Design a protein around this nucleic acid. Sequence first.
RNA 1: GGACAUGGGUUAGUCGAUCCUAAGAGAUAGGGAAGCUCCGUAUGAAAGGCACGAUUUUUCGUGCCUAUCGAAAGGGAAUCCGGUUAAUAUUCCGGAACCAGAAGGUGGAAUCAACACGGCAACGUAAAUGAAGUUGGAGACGUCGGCGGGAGCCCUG
RNA 2: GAGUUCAGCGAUGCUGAAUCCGGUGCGCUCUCGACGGCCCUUGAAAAUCCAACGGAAGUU
RNA 3: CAGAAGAAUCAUCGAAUCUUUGAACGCACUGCGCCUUUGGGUUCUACCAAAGGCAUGCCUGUUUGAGUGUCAUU
Lengths: 433, 396, 235, 206
Amino acid sequence: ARVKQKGKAGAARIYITRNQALKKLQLTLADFRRICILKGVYPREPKNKKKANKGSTAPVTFYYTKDIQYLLHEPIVQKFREYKVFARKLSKALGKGELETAKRLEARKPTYSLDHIIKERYPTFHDALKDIDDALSMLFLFSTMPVTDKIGAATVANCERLCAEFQHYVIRSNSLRKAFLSIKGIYYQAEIFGEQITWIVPYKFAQSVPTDVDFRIMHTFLEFYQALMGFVNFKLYNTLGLRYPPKIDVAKSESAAGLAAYELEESNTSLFSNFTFFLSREVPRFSLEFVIRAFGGKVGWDPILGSGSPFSESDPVITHHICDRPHISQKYEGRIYIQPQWVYDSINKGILERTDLYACGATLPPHLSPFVKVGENDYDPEAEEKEEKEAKELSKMMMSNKQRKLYSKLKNENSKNENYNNALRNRKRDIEK
Amino acid sequence: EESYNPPEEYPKKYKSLRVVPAYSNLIKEKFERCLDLYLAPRVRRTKLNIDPESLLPKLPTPSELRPFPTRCTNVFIGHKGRVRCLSVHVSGNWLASGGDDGVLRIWEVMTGRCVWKCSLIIQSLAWGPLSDSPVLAVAVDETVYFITPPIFSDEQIEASKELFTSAIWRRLHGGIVHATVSTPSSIKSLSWHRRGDYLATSSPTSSSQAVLIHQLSRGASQSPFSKSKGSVQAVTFHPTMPYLLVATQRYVRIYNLVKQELVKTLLTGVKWVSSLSVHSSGDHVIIGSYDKRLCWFDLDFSSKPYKNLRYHSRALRDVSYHPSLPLFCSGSDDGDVQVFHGRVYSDLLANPLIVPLKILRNHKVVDNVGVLSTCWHPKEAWLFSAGAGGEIRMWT
Amino acid sequence: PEVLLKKRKVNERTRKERVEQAIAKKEAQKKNRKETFKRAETFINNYRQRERERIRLNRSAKNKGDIFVPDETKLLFVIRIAGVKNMPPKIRKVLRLLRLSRINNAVFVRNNKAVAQMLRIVEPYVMYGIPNLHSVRELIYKRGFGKINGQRIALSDNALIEEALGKYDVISIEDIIHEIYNVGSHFKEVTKFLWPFTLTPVKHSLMEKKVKHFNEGRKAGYCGEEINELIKKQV
Amino acid sequence: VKWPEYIRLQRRRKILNLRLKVPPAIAQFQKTLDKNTATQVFKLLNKYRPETAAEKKQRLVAEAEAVANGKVSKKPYNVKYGLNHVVALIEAKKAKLVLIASDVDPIELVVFLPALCKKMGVPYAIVKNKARLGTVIHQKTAAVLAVTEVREEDKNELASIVSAVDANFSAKYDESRRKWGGGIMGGKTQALLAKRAKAAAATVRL
RNA sequence: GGACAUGGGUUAGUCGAUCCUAAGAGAUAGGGAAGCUCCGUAUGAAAGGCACGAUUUUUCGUGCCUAUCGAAAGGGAAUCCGGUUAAUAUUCCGGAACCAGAAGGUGGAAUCAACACGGCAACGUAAAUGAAGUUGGAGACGUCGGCGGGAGCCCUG
RNA sequence: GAGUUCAGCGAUGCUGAAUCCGGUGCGCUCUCGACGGCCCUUGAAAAUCCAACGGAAGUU
RNA sequence: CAGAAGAAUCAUCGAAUCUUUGAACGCACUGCGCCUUUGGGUUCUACCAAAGGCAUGCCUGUUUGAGUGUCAUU
């Protein structure tokens, strides 16, 4: 055998740079990124980047050759090519002034289904259910954003439908576990088939687009997530026996009935079972209906919050009347007036809280995180030296890598955070007394 | 656990849910999450299953082995400049120290008295090995004086004289000078042979004659090196058999004077070697280095250092091994002296046990200079530390 | 198993330099594209449209002082569809009175005789109908901006609404929505606080991006219930 | 520098047809209808585009269903195309307006057309590009278009267009079309060839 | 008998070929020729690459640089000793090495003073990142004579 | 511990020893270093390997 | 001859198999490559094997282009 040349095997063969992957696949940078979104293809760093880059030291991103080799035989890439042919045929038809041919082209516009992409990305429904938290967070984020040029109006409608169908399933199966009102939004936490599903739902407010994000990238993610949730929701409804998709009540949807439009016709989960809650016109109905109905509680709301209100403000069957407004001119009786934090603490702790302590115009006891687990010593709101010095001063270098160095991070942040909040209790007690 | 009304820290506190604004950055965070899912390189590690870093260290049992020099109690003061070098007589009662002031002070260890104030820059000073001949060889520039203070008994002065009574030889408040030796270069380090007949002088500036061997019985000097290569930092004699150790800038070379040959070359792996010390067993060498590194060499283990130690924040100045007790010390410009327990077994399979014992502090730093020289008391675990402030510390 | 998501291969430095370079190329182009030539047909076309409007205004005002005043609703939604150069000064003034001084501006108005007369005057330029609850909520929740200190500020938090309209028992966006839908006592104050919406037509389809003079097929005049569909396309 | 051979051929052909003396029947195709009148002509043409194959299929199926289930039409109106067909229409004196492409590659295909239209008293114009004519009739290229019949609505639009083509194409040029084209010389080129000519005339005759 | 018949016999990462080029040949581009075919080898050939990028109106922009055959004697990574067969040995057996490529790991070394120190110097050392782009060296170079060194052989106590 | 040569003793094994110290020469064979001429004809190419200038990039 | 027992060195013949070559086709004429997929191992970023591909001219269509070639675009 001749002298084997350098850089012909090993890391230099296993890894491929982004620009070489572009030339290998004959794709544009945007097209290569899109299939990496649709499939799972992400950069990888070799241990020896200089060796993996044929001796070069220039900054470079690497992929597996086997990952790019898998993209060679991917049917959707031809759909991207078929779209470019389409896009040019439409331009010629519009350039030559043929409106009816262009309309026929637009009707027959090439499409693709992520059927095979979902299956090969997630072999099992358990694998899918694990990686749903990002899908739900993105879908719920876009179900409230205004329609713009970058994002499809029908795409927005798909987000609203898929999010509502998922919420309906969790309500029906009573899979909700925890609900956390953070400054970011409402962190929900359900368990489906043993998997812990946590997603955040933002508040409905008239924000502005940041104008610094690339909605092209978030368009591909949204397209993939909509396909994933459609197939996930289809199985979940079939497992429960419900037909998918649930029928649409267009009039009620146009009357802002929300979840009431979506009829779920068949084809401590009882914490609020014996309670008829009522919602005033100052509270997040989109969140309060979900949490209460997830535990069996009946919910009525102000008509301005939406149509389909089973109850009414005059109906005395109301037991609790959520009203975050600091004033009620319509103060009833037997309808104990509380605030939403009373509700959300009830789901998180699974125990009815103090109505008076959460009554109108209260001090609002602190909101706990149902996700934060108590640390070794972190404060939950609800002779020796001559031996220790040697014990910590010998192996400070009597080793080789001195991997003991991670105490300098681990013990620091843990202890100072413990010392800081163990000090806050001391300060707050002093202020009280 | 940061929300409308959190007690954990004070983000922001909101009196009511209605007042809670819209998080403007939520779109940006989800965008960055999407960016990470396809642009962030992913590496799969072992997660280093929960394992507090304190499991990794070994057990010293320092209490079980406690000849530790505790905080200093005897303070010798009076020297107005940096004490360049100091040494303790074989008896251990007299401490001869000298510095840039040119003042030679002989101190009584048990009392701290300066009985010999007579001065007569002091590069270094080393006592003779023979108790009956208490002669102190003191180097100033290129001149070395063999001083026998009249503090010793008269017969001991005579027992010093008859030992002797390249480098040229020549034969005051008790200025008992015996044989002045002048050399081409400024002598830096002094070493005494075990029998006292040979004195080794090392100078870094010189090349051909950097190291000189002086035979007192013949009253002559010569260069044992036919051709010397590299600068010489320090010189010492092997404590068991006739070898001469040359600590060069980068190496440590063992020279057999009887056969006039080379025995071993130790690669310190260090940019600059400061000083060397030899265990009385003769098979262990400790190298103090300007690279803030202490290298332990086992002559029977490897040419490479057996251990590397880098506690010091500044260049390591001197390293001294206690002649009897299994303890050694390192002094650096940081002002801190490190006392280590180094215990040696004669068994081949038995690796010598080296552990730290103490980090002696509270020493002054002058002109970015801290501890210059350290000496071990011949009897017990007492350390003589010479600082740049003119202070001598008794670490008992 | 221990996955680590390292820092992205994005090179944020050259990323934002490329951003600033793109913006600099934009301001240069906008300053460059000045003073196009105009052909005689456009001047005649403008005149014929102006006389077309003059004939319509005289007919609508004189001998036709009757307006149908869409009923069974106290609220109307009006959006400025079109606009013409050298617009008649009467039309120009009525548009600013309705606060529709710019194209794609949308305003909630009270269904009464006074608005209907002005709305009939400016009929060819405006599309109006009956907004339902879903449209009113979505418009406020997504495209509602308040005039705070006299600037256009997003109604992201109820704190600004409480500060700006607390004296009228208005503390929240839902209070704004209830006032607007039911035409409450403070409907006049709420509408003045609300900045006019900007419902620019959305061109997502490739055909929409290419065709000329695209405006989503926005017709003019009274549409009734169809404006909810138009709102649904924008929100 | 190294241009590709086909690019050099295209550019040399462009200059060569400029420098060479061009016979008047070929030089007439360098003078085309002005932009305003061409735009008005194509506005009338686009009202009489022939039905696309898809539109034709839709209409015929609509009649087929009536015949199949249960069952008088007016004559169609459209622009006339095809070289042989238009030539027969001019020779039959049925053409009201002939629109000749200015860049028919074998120029012999339409080199005789302006004279034939002149002999028959047919209003004609030479308009920019075969592809504009092609787009009207849903083809890639049309060497020539003819208007023979319009609807009574558009009699005045055609009459105004015919008058404009008379004033802006035939009243203009006329003397221009009768002259040999070409000989168009660059500013510094004419001086340079003068230096070449005088040097040649000195002693370079053989 | 080197005949006839019957069987056996050639073992390699390191030895050659394999790889490179030489004078030359030669397909391709083109052009001749009725034609078998001839001329032509960077020739008026669109003569093939590399990097950059939050994705770019989810239709790719920007920048940079621009055949083959022909040498078992030329150029070239790396193996030695002892033993072994009826016949094979730098190949097999025993022992001892070497070269080339490949990944991680262990230990050591350098850095929030950004990529090591020392010596006047020639330069040294266990390490001590170097993209595009630009160079330099080895390969790699006539012949003759004398002198010096070493090895083997020869001479000899 | 191999090989060779001597002695033996008993499948070809086992056991002894020695295998040393020199001197050298216009010697022969091969190679290297340092010169000195003659050149003129100032003395193949490529694969392959190395280095330099250059400064992109960058408690964990 | 031995051996075997729908036999057959049978006939017919419509299913197949059909090594290396040759117009002879990845490039050369003991060899040397490239691309795709799959597999093995007592060792898995390495090595190996297998299968399927890679000649020239021309035609039809497809896709992607180039042109200071001919134009249009208020």
